[PDB]
């Protein structure tokens, strides 16, 4: 996570995407419904 | 056309407008920015063809479809932007670089608008930057969306509406809860006061066995419409694909202009060269020597120097 | 650029759900307890007790990947390839060879 | 977030909904919370009765005083507890009468 | 720039200029050279023949909604050849209906 | 300041470093929507109160 | 007011010693102590990614 | 400063008042200390008497080209010395004449 082919995949049409990003999921706590989560940067970002 | 809950609002606080903001992407090289939204605009009512008007959520306890002047749209980050198209759920516009993307379909008093945090910065393509596209210049290739509504990025899997229950169609009175269905809008009152207790009626009825309208609630069935698989709306029952809809502005090659340097001076000397470059603006500069030994020398360049 | 999409979230009003496996790009799934959430009435589930609320996430391309993405190869032995301009005497000829 | 709906020229005391009981909070605990609205958010319009709980109108509604840059006539009002630290939100919205 | 005039209300499929001879473009390359409009350039009312630069009327040409942005009443539109890379530019001027 | 009396903008204006700053362990541009609650301080808009 | 909370960091560890691994977009604060007669108080704002 | 007040429509010439009395410059030191018209206030409607410091209309009064940047009729000069240096503001507030 956070470094070069954090993603990856054969090709762009694909659907045997693999990937590692290392998100976490969690506990929502103000009342309105919505999911939050945390995630590292895209690594592709950081090698670019 | 759904509403979806807002980050942030001209009232800074939690909002659930229908122009909810969702990925703002921004990888176009003449600096257009690709923003989803959760506001239908490029159909009229009905969703048929219309440029002139854009169709959201509504606020009303019918909690309908209201269709209205596209005129109000003003895309602005850290000044007013200008819109470079628009289709259904994407818009397509040019701004100042900023830190936020803001969308404002207010009119005058209609003061709807929703903003999320996506970094805006003023980027150039070429080894040297410019503030705008220059007269003179060698043309490099280059990528930018495309203005054309019809060419497609990708597509969205939209679903069935989830089961979304408003507070008013439940009433209680004396401790009982009487439903009251909207008129000729049938509700499923789906209700467990200890045991299970479904059914649809359109009167106001009174859940037998049931005391607490907490235990209690109150929606319709408008599952004809489709919507976006937004983290906004509880998923329905079934959650599978129910269509797509293309992704609009599609990023394409072009042509961009770039600047041209001032050519260097160069003044010889044993076994070694000076340049007395001059530029204005950050020039790149790259010297590699021919043999085997790369040495490669890169520096961003200010000013003049040698 | 990965795009992380989230699906729209599920809830059981006061039943339990289970988090399935899948096979999505670092397919993430969790479980959370009472919850007793909020739309736009103000009450999306009656019995606010035990309110499973199923979190999915996973990741996919971005839209705009069909154009600015990188392919990692792997290089093995070379081979050189030469376009030669011979002229003999007064007759000359141009050829490439491996 | 909570609704409420409301008319014009409604008088002071006129009664508009229990914030505590809509988000299931023990009445008798929002003293031992201090709760009350956020001081960023409070209009005199509306006023709140701190041990009960009751939300009421405290001037005279008027969608052309109060709602200048809001058609729909939302005031947006907002409510938080200390023992622990919780916060809720509140819209208010003014709707037309129908006896015109 | 080739400057062009073009009057309203025309319809579908009229003739506007041949922008290739106009600039000397080889009619029978601009395939060759990808000869196509700029994306960020195109504009709904108008429309280009790839293969000659015969420059044909797409939409009825609608003198109020174009001219909100202008009372000149302004089309803009700019095209190009990949190899080599030239960049060329035209402006259309929607003229009002002198015969009222 | 600025009085628009129709063209009259009868206007004032005084130096004062106004930086944007935040409360807590975290710079942000905007309250996020999941976090923390923490102690924070803030001018009443109940024009009644008194400082 | 509500506060943002940080991506939850990676801890690896080895003989006598810690590496946290963090991502933060924006500047976070981190501060550490050791629990005995010193302190050794260390203070440091980060932003992106580093160890 | 000085404040000053003239009527609209006066002739070129039309004396309104005098800076250098009012302020109590010296009248014949003037030309010593070089008193003249601050560059960046000068306005095309007045004009001043160096050798007395004396401000006169120069063109036309008119709150429709006057008073364009702001209706309050206030227009607003500056002045100074050299020797030593001193600087001095005058306001001359254009009145709504009783003849109106």
Redesign the interface.
């Known amino acids: 996570p956070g470094a070069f082919g954090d993603i990856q995949a054969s090709s762009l049409d694909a659907t045997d995407i693999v990937a590692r990003t290392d998100i976490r999921l969690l506990k929502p706590s ?3 419904i919505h999911v939050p989560y945390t995630q590292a940067v895209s690594g592709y970002e950081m090698w670019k | 056309p759904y509403l979806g809950f807002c980050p942030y609002c001209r ?1 800074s ?2 909002c ?1 407008s229908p122009i909810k903001i969702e990925n703002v992407w921004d990888e176009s090289d003449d600096g257009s920015i690709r923003i989803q939204v959760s506001a239908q605009f490029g159909y009229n009512q009905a969703g048929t063809a219309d440029v002139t008007k854009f169709r959201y959520m509504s ?1 009303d306890h019918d909690h309908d479809i209201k269709e209205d002047s596209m005129e109000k749209l003003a895309i602005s980050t850290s000044g007013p932007c200008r819109r470079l198209g628009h289709k259904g759920y994407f818009l397509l516009a040019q701004c100042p670089p900023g830190d936020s993307v803001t969308v404002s379909i207010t009119s ?4 709807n608008s929703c903003t999320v945090e996506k970094k805006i910065r003023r980027k150039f393509v070429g080894r040297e930057e410019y503030l705008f596209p220059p007269v003179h210049g060698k043309l490099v290739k280059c990528h930018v969306y495309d203005h054309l509504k019809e060419t497609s990025a990708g597509y969205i899997t939209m679903h069935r509406p989830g089961p979304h229950a408003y ?2 169609y439940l009433e209680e009175a004396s401790g009982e809860v009487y439903i009251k269905p909207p008129s000729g809008k049938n509700v499923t009152y789906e209700c467990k006061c200890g045991d299970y207790s479904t059914g649809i009626v359109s009167t106001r009825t009174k859940m037998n066995g049931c005391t607490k309208a ?1 235990q209690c609630i109150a929606y319709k069935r408008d599952q004809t419409k489709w919507v976006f698989n937004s983290p906004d709306l509880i998923r329905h029952t079934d959650h599978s694909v129910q269509g797509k809809l293309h992704i609009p502005f599609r990023l394409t090659p072009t042509v961009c202009p770039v600047p041209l340097a001032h050519t260097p001076t160069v003044t010889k000397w044993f076994k070694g060269i000076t340049l007395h470059l001059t530029a204005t603006r950050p020039t790149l500069l790259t010297t590699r020597k021919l043999g085997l030994r790369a040495d490669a020398t890169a520096e961003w360049i200010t000013g003049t120097t040698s | 650029k990965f795009h992380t999409v989230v699906p729209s979230p599920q809830v059981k009003c006061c039943g339990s759900l289970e988090c399935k496996a899948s096979s999505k790009a670092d397919y993430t799934c969790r479980v959370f307890g009472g919850v ?1 959430p ?1 739309m ?3 009450a999306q589930c009656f019995c ?1 007790s035990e309110n499973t609320q199923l979190s999915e996430a996973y990741v996919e391309f971005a839209p705009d990947c069909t154009i600015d993405h990188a392919v990692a190869l792997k290089v093995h032995t070379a081979a050189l390839k030469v376009g030669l301009r011979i002229v003999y005497g007064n007759t000359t000829a141009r050829l490439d060879t491996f | ?3 409420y ?1 409301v008319q014009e020229e409604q008088e002071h005391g006129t009664f508009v909904g229990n914030i505590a009981e ?3 909070l023990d009445i008798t605990k929002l003293s031992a919370r201090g709760f009350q609205t956020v ?6 319009y509306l006023d709140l009765n701190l041990e009960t709980g009751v939300l009421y109108v405290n001037e005279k509604i008027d969608r052309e005083q109060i ?6 006539c939302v005031l ?1 009002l ?1 409510v938080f507890l200390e023992n622990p ?5 509140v819209e208010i ?1 003014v709707l037309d009468i129908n006896d015109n």
Do not use: I, M
């Open positions: 103000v009342k309105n | 009232h606080a939690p659930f606020y005058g008093a209609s003061e507070k008013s907490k | 007793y909020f736009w009435g103000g606010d | 977030q909570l609704h709906t809509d988000l299931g001081p960023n958010s409070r209009t005199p709602c200048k840059q809001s058609p729909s947006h907002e630290l919780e916060l809720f939100q919205e």
